[PDB]
Amino acid sequence: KLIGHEAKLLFLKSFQFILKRQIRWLITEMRFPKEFEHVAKIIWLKILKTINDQPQEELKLQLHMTSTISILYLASTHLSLPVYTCDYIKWICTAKMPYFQASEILRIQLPNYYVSILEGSISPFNGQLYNKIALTCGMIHFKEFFNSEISCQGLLLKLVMQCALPPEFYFYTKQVIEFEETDIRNLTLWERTDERHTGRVSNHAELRVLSYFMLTINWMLSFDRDRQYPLKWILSLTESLTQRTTTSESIGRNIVKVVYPDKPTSSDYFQWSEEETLEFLKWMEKQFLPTQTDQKIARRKLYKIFPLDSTHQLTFIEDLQERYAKQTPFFPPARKEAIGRLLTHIASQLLVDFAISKEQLKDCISRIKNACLHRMN
Amino acid sequence: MFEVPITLTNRKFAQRRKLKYQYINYISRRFDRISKQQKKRRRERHWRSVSFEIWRTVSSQNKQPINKQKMTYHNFKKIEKIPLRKMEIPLLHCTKENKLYFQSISRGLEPLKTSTSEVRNYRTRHIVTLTDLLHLNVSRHNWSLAYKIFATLIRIPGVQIKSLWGIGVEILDNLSNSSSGLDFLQWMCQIYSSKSRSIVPPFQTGSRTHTAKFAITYLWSSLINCQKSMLIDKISEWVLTPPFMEDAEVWFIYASCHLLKADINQVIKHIHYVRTFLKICLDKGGFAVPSRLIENQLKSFES
Amino acid sequence: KMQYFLSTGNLVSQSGLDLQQVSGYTVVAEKINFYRFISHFRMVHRGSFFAQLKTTT
Amino acid sequence: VQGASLYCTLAEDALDLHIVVKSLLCDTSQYIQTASDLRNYRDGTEIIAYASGKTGSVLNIAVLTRQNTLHLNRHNNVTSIELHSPIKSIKIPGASESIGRRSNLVGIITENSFQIFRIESVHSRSCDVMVSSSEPLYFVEIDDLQVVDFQFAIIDIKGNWSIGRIPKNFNNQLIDNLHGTIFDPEELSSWKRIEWFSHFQKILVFDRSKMIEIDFMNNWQTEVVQAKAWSNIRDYKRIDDKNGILLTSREIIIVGASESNDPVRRISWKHDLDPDDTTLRITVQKVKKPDHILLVAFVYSMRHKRIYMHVFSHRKANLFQSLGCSTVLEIPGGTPTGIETIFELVVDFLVKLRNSSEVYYYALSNTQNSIIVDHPEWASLFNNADEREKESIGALVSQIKLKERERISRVQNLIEHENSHDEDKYLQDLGYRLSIATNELLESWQKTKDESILSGSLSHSKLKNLLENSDSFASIPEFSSLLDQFFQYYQDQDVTFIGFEKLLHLFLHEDVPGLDIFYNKLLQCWVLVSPQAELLTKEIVKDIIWSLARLEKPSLFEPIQNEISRSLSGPYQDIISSWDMDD
Amino acid sequence: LKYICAECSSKLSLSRTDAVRCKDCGHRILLKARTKRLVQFEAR
Amino acid sequence: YFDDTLNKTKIKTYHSSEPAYIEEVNLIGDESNKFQELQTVSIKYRIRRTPQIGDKF
Amino acid sequence: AVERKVYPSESRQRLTSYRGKLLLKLKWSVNNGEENLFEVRDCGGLPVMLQSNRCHLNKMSPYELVQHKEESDEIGGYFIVNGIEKLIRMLIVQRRNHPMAIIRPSFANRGASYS
Ligand SMILES: [Mg+2]
Numbered sequence A: 001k002l003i004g005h006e007a008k009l010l011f012l013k014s015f016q017f018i019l020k021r022q023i024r025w026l027i028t029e030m031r032f033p034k035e036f037e038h039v040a041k042i043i044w045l046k047i048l049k050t051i052n053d054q055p056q057e058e059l060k061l062q063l064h065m066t067s068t069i070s071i072l073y074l075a076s077t078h079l080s081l082p083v084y085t086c087d088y089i090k091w092i093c094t095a096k097m098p099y100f101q102a103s104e105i106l107r108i109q110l111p112n113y114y115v116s117i118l119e120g121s122i123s124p125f126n127g128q129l130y131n132k133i134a135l136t137c138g139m140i141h142f143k144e145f146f147n148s149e150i151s152c153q154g155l156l157l158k159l160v161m162q163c164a165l166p167p168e169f170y171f172y173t174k175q176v177i178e179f180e181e182t183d184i185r186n187l188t189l190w191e192r193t194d195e196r197h198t199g200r201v202s203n204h205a206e207l208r209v210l211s212y213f214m215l216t217i218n219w220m221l222s223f224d225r226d227r228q229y230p231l232k233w234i235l236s237l238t239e240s241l242t243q244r245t246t247t248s249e250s251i252g253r254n255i256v257k258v259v260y261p262d263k264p265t266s267s268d269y270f271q272w273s274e275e276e277t278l279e280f281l282k283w284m285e286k287q288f289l290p291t292q293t294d295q296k297i298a299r300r301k302l303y304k305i306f307p308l309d310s311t312h313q314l315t316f317i318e319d320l321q322e323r324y325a326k327q328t329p330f331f332p333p334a335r336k337e338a339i340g341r342l343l344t345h346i347a348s349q350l351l352v353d354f355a356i357s358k359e360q361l362k363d364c365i366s367r368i369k370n371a372c373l374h375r376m377n
Numbered sequence B: 001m002f003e004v005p006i007t008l009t010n011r012k013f014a015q016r017r018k019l020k021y022q023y024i025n026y027i028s029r030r031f032d033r034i035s036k037q038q039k040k041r042r043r044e045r046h047w048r049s050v051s052f053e054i055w056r057t058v059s060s061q062n063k064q065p066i067n068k069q070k071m072t073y074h075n076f077k078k079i080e081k082i083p084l085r086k087m088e089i090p091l092l093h094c095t096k097e098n099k100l101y102f103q104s105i106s107r108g109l110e111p112l113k114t115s116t117s118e119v120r121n122y123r124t125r126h127i128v129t130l131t132d133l134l135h136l137n138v139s140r141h142n143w144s145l146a147y148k149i150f151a152t153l154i155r156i157p158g159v160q161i162k163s164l165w166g167i168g169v170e171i172l173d174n175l176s177n178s179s180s181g182l183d184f185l186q187w188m189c190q191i192y193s194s195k196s197r198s199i200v201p202p203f204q205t206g207s208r209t210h211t212a213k214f215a216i217t218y219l220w221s222s223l224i225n226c227q228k229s230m231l232i233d234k235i236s237e238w239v240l241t242p243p244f245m246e247d248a249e250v251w252f253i254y255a256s257c258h259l260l261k262a263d264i265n266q267v268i269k270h271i272h273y274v275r276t277f278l279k280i281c282l283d284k285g286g287f288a289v290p291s292r293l294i295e296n297q298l299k300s301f302e303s
Numbered sequence C: 001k002m003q004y005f006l007s008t009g010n011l012v013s014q015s016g017l018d019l020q021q022v023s024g025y026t027v028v029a030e031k032i033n034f035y036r037f038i039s040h041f042r043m044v045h046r047g048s049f050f051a052q053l054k055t056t057t
Numbered sequence D: 001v002q003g004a005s006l007y008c009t010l011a012e013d014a015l016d017l018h019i020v021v022k023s024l025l026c027d028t029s030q031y032i033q034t035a036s037d038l039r040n041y042r043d044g045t046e047i048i049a050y051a052s053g054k055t056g057s058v059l060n061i062a063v064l065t066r067q068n069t070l071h072l073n074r075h076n077n078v079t080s081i082e083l084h085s086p087i088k089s090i091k092i093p094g095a096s097e098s099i100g101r102r103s104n105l106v107g108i109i110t111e112n113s114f115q116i117f118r119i120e121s122v123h124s125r126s127c128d129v130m131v132s133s134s135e136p137l138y139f140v141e142i143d144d145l146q147v148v149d150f151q152f153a154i155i156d157i158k159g160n161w162s163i164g165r166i167p168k169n170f171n172n173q174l175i176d177n178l179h180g181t182i183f184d185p186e187e188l189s190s191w192k193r194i195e196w197f198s199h200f201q202k203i204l205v206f207d208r209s210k211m212i213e214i215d216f217m218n219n220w221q222t223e224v225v226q227a228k229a230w231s232n233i234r235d236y237k238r239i240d241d242k243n244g245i246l247l248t249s250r251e252i253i254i255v256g257a258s259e260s261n262d263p264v265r266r267i268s269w270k271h272d273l274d275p276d277d278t279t280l281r282i283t284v285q286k287v288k289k290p291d292h293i294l295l296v297a298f299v300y301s302m303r304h305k306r307i308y309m310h311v312f313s314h315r316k317a318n319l320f321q322s323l324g325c326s327t328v329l330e331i332p333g334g335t336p337t338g339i340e341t342i343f344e345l346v347v348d349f350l351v352k353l354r355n356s357s358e359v360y361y362y363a364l365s366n367t368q369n370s371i372i373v374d375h376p377e378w379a380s381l382f383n384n385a386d387e388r389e390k391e392s393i394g395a396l397v398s399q400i401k402l403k404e405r406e407r408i409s410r411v412q413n414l415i416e417h418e419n420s421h422d423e424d425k426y427l428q429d430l431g432y433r434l435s436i437a438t439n440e441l442l443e444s445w446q447k448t449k450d451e452s453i454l455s456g457s458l459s460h461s462k463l464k465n466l467l468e469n470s471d472s473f474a475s476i477p478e479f480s481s482l483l484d485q486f487f488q489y490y491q492d493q494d495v496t497f498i499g500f501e502k503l504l505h506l507f508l509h510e511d512v513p514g515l516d517i518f519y520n521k522l523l524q525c526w527v528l529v530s531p532q533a534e535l536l537t538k539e540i541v542k543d544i545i546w547s548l549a550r551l552e553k554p555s556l557f558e559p560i561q562n563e564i565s566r567s568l569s570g571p572y573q574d575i576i577s578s579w580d581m582d583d
Numbered sequence E: 001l002k003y004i005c006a007e008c009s010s011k012l013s014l015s016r017t018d019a020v021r022c023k024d025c026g027h028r029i030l031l032k033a034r035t036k037r038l039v040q041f042e043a044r
Numbered sequence F: 001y002f003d004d005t006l007n008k009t010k011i012k013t014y015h016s017s018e019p020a021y022i023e024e025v026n027l028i029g030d031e032s033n034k035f036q037e038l039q040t041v042s043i044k045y046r047i048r049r050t051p052q053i054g055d056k057f
Numbered sequence G: 001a002v003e004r005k006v007y008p009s010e011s012r013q014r015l016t017s018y019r020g021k022l023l024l025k026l027k028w029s030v031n032n033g034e035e036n037l038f039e040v041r042d043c044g045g046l047p048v049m050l051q052s053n054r055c056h057l058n059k060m061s062p063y064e065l066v067q068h069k070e071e072s073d074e075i076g077g078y079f080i081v082n083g084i085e086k087l088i089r090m091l092i093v094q095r096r097n098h099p100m101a102i103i104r105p106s107f108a109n110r111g112a113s114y115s
């Protein structure tokens, strides 16, 4: 029935087909530029040419889904588009961009060795995405062939708006950024291996950006000898950040919280509310039609025994505005507490949003914090 | 923090079950010596027994006296010393975490992390949250939400129906619309009474020998849907229909249908009828009023 | 209940109503043609009781 | 149902739940067999006196320290000053039993340890609690002991048990003569358990495999009806009334208890509760009322701080029924190491959480008619140590703060000039100055045009090396018009095209048609919050529009060259696999 | 456009599992409408 | 129509021994607020009567 | 979803009944007036006579009748029940409140004493 030992050709066809399918969804539904597609044929072309410059009938390829997302991010980053990894994580964990299947339920029957090579390694959630984009960035070289500078300043904007920080922190963190780097940010972390143990927890540019962001808030707020930032407004900031409200975004972050590996975030789904659960089942019947894989009609009637079944909630800049106002009353050692709880909530949001670990993040901001103390002392 | 209504994500839990029951075999084997594979796990788990209406237990009498200490330090480590190395062989084939689990359960320590707590796949973790919210809402009397949870859940292609008591009490307390708890139950029996392991304790079962909970509960609860009345010859028409002879409880249901229909020579025949089925209900494991009370109602009838 | 009466056409009461029969009270307004239709509304009889009686009078 | 229509479909009752009342009381993966804290009321003197509610609490460095002190009760349940003792062993359960009221209100208190098994007496007067150390036995056996039950000191060590007795007051120590075993080679988990039954002088012995009754002053032993096919015995505690038994299996609350003078099993049906968690435990509280006698079952865990509660009732026809389930939560990270109990329901207990020396009194009522963060992983990241690493941070903070002042005073005048003829001159010579540099870079893109190895022309997307020309303007709409007429100007083909609006879509999460409305929305948000929000918002929309400001490699006709040429060097039928427009 | 509303007369079409009702009125009664097709007759 | 319990497409056939033509086909929708799909239809047949032997005048 | 008129043509085509809502004002009087409750009850759909003061064709001109799919000079006087046009037919009962003198054999058979 199914191919033997040269279903490399069919494998790469379901893979490439799934890629162009995703591109279709992001130019169409995300209003990308048509140039992206060509940038994708070039990158997928380079690594296709590199795996078909490889001999063995033993396949040795890993075209996991992380490779799809890896060349999408790679191409997007060459094109300097202000999309970041967290956009991709959100997009795929909310079933909008089709992902979590081989040729989703509707196709082809392949050797179960390759269906496993697809379904396996599916998760991006421990930094697998950063590691796979750096791995691809070795597989074909970032430096001469492409421009692997991240879209830094839009990430800063994304970040300040993602909190409710006043726009001064964009320039604050932008400045600490310039202070340690002078704004030079790469994509490879590659020396093909598994092995690494120092220097290289922190050289995916983004993670360092978040690290500078956190640091900035901590330093800045704990050394406003001016007293520009009230002992209270740090609390009011924490509370306007904490109040679970139903916008497209936060609903999304809940949807990502559901498939994040570590507690607490699943205790976070515990502390959600009937409308969150409802819009959840909604997204379940919508985007888990993107499912995977006599008595049959007996189960069509059997399930058809129980029913399958002025705009209320607000937009993003609406919520953003209203918490910006919820703090609009702007104009002693236990304020360090307020600094800490704000930093830890911000951290939480970053951990679920950028699919990394608690320990990963704090490793990075620890390392690069000592990397600022060292070039400051 | 609640049970999940999904088959547990697999590999490592199964190979750990291997290591566990395999070592169990070697220790208990050498233990019987000193007193003188899915299938290895299978035989292993196998040879072992697998004023109000209290379905009483089996209390303490006719059970054998004693034992006096079998196991000193030296004697136990005698039994333990060899099967642990035999274990050293396939431990080399399993994974390092699995090997650690084997080391710790074999020391006697109990693992920190549940199967759920270490589980990992998108769809299954989402089903876990779905089912959880079902159970939570049903606990919270939120029959509306809970109903949405149930419908969205049964939609998913992975869920066979344990969840039926959820919908029985669900549509029961719902009263809202949909062809109701009775309809669901009699559906359950009509679809799953004909040819047409891990997961299974008694509250969901197969129809070789007793499917219990749902059947007896639609039975009684339907007789209470006659408490709505004062339908009966219907209920005992389809209690008449099935052969599953080890019941008697449907004999008392039958005789109760005749006492309820007895509330002129027709009423006589109904009273002689209940008089008959109470003894052909002494057939089996007895449901007893003093039953001279049953007869005393029957003499209040004989008036 | 009134619909049932119109639909099936029988007199149901514990009273007779002082009438000698239990059925034949309504009839279809046959529209076979107009001449038949109009006739229905100008028709009168004594009732099924006096129909089985074997005199000519 | 069962009795309602055995008599001749909703419930008994309407729907009521759980509330809290909280208070502080006192301050101090593979897990094992332990549980260590008690409080119970007795009076020693019994020269016609009363009982005193006492705590046996536990003090830890290594868990060496046992502490006994009194509790004075009230609606506000506090303590009075502390009384103490140590042992060299790591300490496990404190237990102080009390035989039910066939007889008397009982004496003093026992503990199990790392080696030892000790039992103390006590006398007390005038707010002091003086205890005396009824003597240890380190072991006969070199075996740890699972459970103590209670005048009879009963021990269980993993798979063998002993009935023993305690000395009288002073200074001879504890002996035994009746012994046994329930050893089972094929149960690896170490916990076994002894608690007896009916006070009949007959015991219960447990392992996660089975439940064995032992009538121990005759010779008698029984394995009661289930074994270990589908669930583990998870815990058991004697629901306080002598003839009453509460057992947690997996997915079942079991109410054993005699309904015959001889010992029992109850299969009077039961409720079920839903995990794989090994760490579950249970305890009951018992409230009294006229028409019933009801029991609240707390099943708790070491994984999640939630408490799982069910309720039963004893209408003494030995009638038992069940109502419906309820569960409450508990706070940050950690989980219960101890839950201990003592037209509405009040049920009150104490909890101690994993790795928190605090002991919290709780109370629960029916209706309503009447983070301090030390996350050592992040604080170690935020507080950094040495004084020069304090004034270091402050130094950097000042550097940037005065820098920001430079930004404000700098841009201010640039804001003064809007729609001026000066800013017009600047937008002209700016726009087409940049156009000249752009053409130059396009020529040096013609010289290297035939690379055909890549398709990313070097260091492209820029203002292209004139940097001061960016900043100086300060009017978003005339700048958007500059860019629209620059894109218009370089419409001479083989040049990049990229539509911003469709990308600001990603920024504000709604359709952002104009480069201006972007500035509006940000400006509303920040005008709520900062002075010179117009200056910053303008400086940041300028910074964004620059960070994105496209000028990538020569356009779509240039990439396809390298597209096909790399699609050449590849061997022939990967080239056959390379496939556009799937379906 | 196979069908016609019996109340408002709006011409309209249906699909697989569609609202058997007028998309304007909400009247649930529809008249069929009929399409170029060969029927043959003898003129007698 | 398609029958689900049969997984087959079945067919109501014309029964008169006298041939006819289709005149009106009415879709009788249901009330109780929409949602329900088509279940009831009325078909009106037209039968030619060139006057035959045995017809009465 | 607010009410709309139903004309008899619809009833004919749906093959149901042409009916209006029958309402009764129920008086429920406790203790001879001490406390009396009122409630208006929906007592079903009462078939209505065509062209009567409870029919929607009442007072319509020929032109309007035609626009409502009725015969131009629709007479009415009948009911529509399950698509069938049913008339309660006229009965020729006796004569009200007049004492007739009767000679009838049947009267003699109520007893030997009866004439
Ligand atoms: Mg057994």
Ligand SMILES: [Zn+2]
Pocket (backbone or CB within 6 Å): E005, E006, E007, E008, E009, E010, E022, E023, E024, E025, E026, E027
């Ligand atoms: Zn219409």
